[PDB]
Amino acid sequence: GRRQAIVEAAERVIARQGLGGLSHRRVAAEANVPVGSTTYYFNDLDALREAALAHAANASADLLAQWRSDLDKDRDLAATLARLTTVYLADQDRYRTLNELYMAAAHRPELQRLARLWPDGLLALLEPRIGRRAANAVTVFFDGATLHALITGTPLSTDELTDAIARLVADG
Amino acid sequence: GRRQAIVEAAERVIARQGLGGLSHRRVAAEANVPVGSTTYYFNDLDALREAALAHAANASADLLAQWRSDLDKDRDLAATLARLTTVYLADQDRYRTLNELYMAAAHRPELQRLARLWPDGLLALLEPRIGRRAANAVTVFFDGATLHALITGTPLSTDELTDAIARLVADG
Incomplete structure (x- = not known):
């Protein structure tokens, strides 16, 4: 499973360095494999960029x-979204990478097609349930919860997330 | 004029490469000026680093x-915050760079003391007025509004910002 490990390492490098910071030596180091192995699987770095982004997209x-x-299995939307957000914040295994890739896209336009999958999908998921306005407010708050937690070094509790989300989705 | 363009470029390079990843080639590329210029204004990269950190803290x-x-009108809080946020999201020519440096702190610990000035400052402004819960909810939402706007390419409307902020700050 060498190839897959190289692709996933490339995700992590791209999140930290951008598509332009991607190099065989950096990927080799991040995957702890010989550099020659990376050039064998991906001599063309653009093929590695494509594979890495596609891997992230699928995830x-x-x-x-x-x-x-x-x-679909829970009647309490606010509590369910909050628990899902808590898991997302807490995850340290490529949930973390996906989030890092997402935040890297904010000022790296080349990564925005990948990044947009998430807010577009969440909006699509939520709009039929809570309306376009609430779906947008909640997707924005989700982005905030993850970013703010990392910047300030402290996360909102699931209870605090539940309260805020409940406020955003309630009938007016 | 060019000196300031270089300082801002340095802020972006620090955001992407870290406090130690600063180089004349990288700053010149980022400022779109010759390396001749970066070396004239800042022969010592340490002096450039200091200028960028100072600029960001002052901003x-x-x-x-x-x-x-x-x-400080003690009136119309949700709408005032929404208008201020709209001003921020609309002014990319002014804040794009400072926002990049702010976000970079999410996965670069060395940039966190600088980044934290903002939410800590916002909390001090809002906590006595609306309490810790609401003030934190609003600061999280602001971070979300800025990130989501950059990712999706369009900001939440002032109307929608006011509505969501009003929901977050309202009595339980």
Whole structure:
């Protein structure tokens, strides 16, 4: 499973360095494999960029699908979205990378097609349930919760998330 | 004029490469000026680093001062915060760079003391007025509004910002 490990390392490098900071030596180091192995699988770095972004895209798409299932099984939307957000914040395994890739896109336009999958998908998921206005406010708050937690070094509790989300989705 | 363009470029390079990733080639590329220029204004990269950190800290103080000023009418809080946020999201030519440096702190610990001036300053402004819960909810929402706007390419409307902020700050 060498190739896959190289692709996932490339995700982590791209999140930290951008598509332009991607190099065989950096990926080799991040995957702890010989540099020559990376050039064998991906001598053309553009092929690695494509593979890495596609891997991230699949993970993003798959995650949103799981959110969809979980939301369909629970009558308390605010509490369910809050628990999902708590898991997302707490995750240290490529949930973290996906989030880092997402924040890297904010000022790296080349990563925005990948990044947009998430807010577009969440809006699509929520709009039929709570309306376009509430779906937008909640997707924005979600972005805030993750960013603010990392910047300030402290997360909102699931209870605090539940309260805020409840406020955003309630009938006016 | 060019000196300031270089200082701002340095802020972006620090955001992308860290406090130690500063180089003349990288700053010149980012400022779109010859390396001749970066070396004239800042022969010592340490001096450039200091100037960028100082600029960012001053900009953050200046912004907080502007918010405090408009919030000192003790009236119409949600709409005042929405208008201020709209001003921020609309002014990419002014804040794009400072926002990048702010966000970079999310995954670069060394940039966090600088970044934290903003939310800490916002909390001090809002906590006595609306309490810790609401003030934190609003600061999280602001971070979300800025990130989501950059990712999706369009900001929440002032109307929608007011509505969501009103929901977050309202009595339980």
